[PDB]
Symmetry: C3
Subunit: 206 residues, 3 copies
Amino acid sequence: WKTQPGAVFAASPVIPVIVIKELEDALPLAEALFAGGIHVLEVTLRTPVAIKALELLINTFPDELIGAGTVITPGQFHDVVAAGARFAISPGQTRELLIAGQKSEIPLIPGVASVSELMEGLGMGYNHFKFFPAAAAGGIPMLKAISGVFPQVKFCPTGGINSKNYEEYLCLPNVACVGGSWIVPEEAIKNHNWSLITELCMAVSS
Amino acid sequence: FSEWKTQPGAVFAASPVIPVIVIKELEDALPLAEALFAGGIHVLEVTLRTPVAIKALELLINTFPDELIGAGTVITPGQFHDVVAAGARFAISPGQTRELLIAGQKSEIPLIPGVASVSELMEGLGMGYNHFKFFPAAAAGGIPMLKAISGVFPQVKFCPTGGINSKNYEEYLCLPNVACVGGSWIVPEEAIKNHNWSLITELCMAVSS
Amino acid sequence: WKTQPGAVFAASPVIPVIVIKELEDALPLAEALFAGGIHVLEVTLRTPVAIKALELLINTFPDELIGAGTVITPGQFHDVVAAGARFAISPGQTRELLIAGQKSEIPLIPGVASVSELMEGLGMGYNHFKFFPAAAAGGIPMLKAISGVFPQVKFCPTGGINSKNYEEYLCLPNVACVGGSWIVPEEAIKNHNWSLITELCMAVSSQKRE
């Protein structure tokens, strides 16, 4: 790991959760994010073209922190490493995935939602996690309770984070950044509203 | 993995509501079953929550061999082997362990394990499971939890159980990743104790039609 | 196990979750707890002096049920056992910690927050658990739903339990006791407010019925 997990969190207060259904949208969406001050991109493995979109983004804009999300299996993890991803994010964790991230060249950010899941990740050497789905898995009260026992663990809450609540999450001492789709809404991507997306990103990156 | 003759999706497709059956008195098994059948419910989950449960399971399977009768509250591999040997057509669990998931993939009979977090779901997927009980649904994040999961695992199918009732079950059934729900409200212990088989049939008919 | 997990839960309706910053406060705090009827002490591994306080309390009061909390790792479990702890409590569980507790004469109370976590503990011989953080992880509805499927499993809910809600938790058939800092607030410890701590403990001791 040359890129440290903490670098995936320090890049932006908000990590955009990107769903790319059409490959032609990948590059103009990325340029819109860059113009809006966002230099970390999580390309989720949720569509057939996602791997090709990740490859296209890394080939075109290699000096951005472009990684993959929804990495569920070791096989997907090796696929995104091979595609050039700078990091891998998962909505949860498995033992196999945690093992795979130990010997990897790029950081894995596993997802957890209970103290035992956190402790399993900690035992494997991980101390940067996604908290997912944050709003449905206990929200701010959960993160405060965890902070009292694991003050040094750092989280990126994702899932139900939006304009109205994201500052409340960011203010927590164990929250390094948040993630969500509200700055890259699917409707604006589908309809090529790139300048709008820049404006939504500017509202959170300034 | 998951090449069972009886597929979990077929179990889920048989009824919008799987009744969570608690049988305390063996004499109640047949009339309770008749009330369910009459109310259009032909998938029965006999829970392993009472001393007579295994006997009631065996009695129901032997008496009604053409019905889709299985077991619930299957916690251990030993209990799973017990309900297989009793003739259960499926096993449902409120959660999962590696050993339980291993037992289900070694069996002719499908296992429907329980999950409540994304990591638990991911361990289940790693063992070839993609049909799960979500338990206890209402206390483990409810509809917002299921909606969040659907955006990330759109193919995974759930049977939410735990706090599902007449007033909210349709809200759960409308979700794209919910194939059916489970609950005791259509087989309530008060009606079973009173031998109120007409009421049970009426409750079942309301959800099956 | 020299002490049974159920004995840890049966000692008091409320286990005091102790954060001790100054070693000289350990003996006077114990006196305030004893005077309020409470003889189970959970010294949390959250301060530099916690291990030394644990050892001091056990050596001073060997006949009291003095144990450790916030035991995260097998290494910490071995440290508190060597320190003389009568029990160890964890906010969660891992396979490694469950294995370590199997090999000890000192009871381990793992923390769980889902049925699958409970089942992993059950499979390794555990049926007394902390439910943490109780108020944020599903609360009373979660415990009630679990009680129907695991009537043999006993819980100590901790995290967000206070004087306003603890009796509601205690009424549940699968809740043997609760844990909380509200009967041992850090401000009262720092200020040597033993009369307040004793008053708070006396209130929860009159709720002990077995």
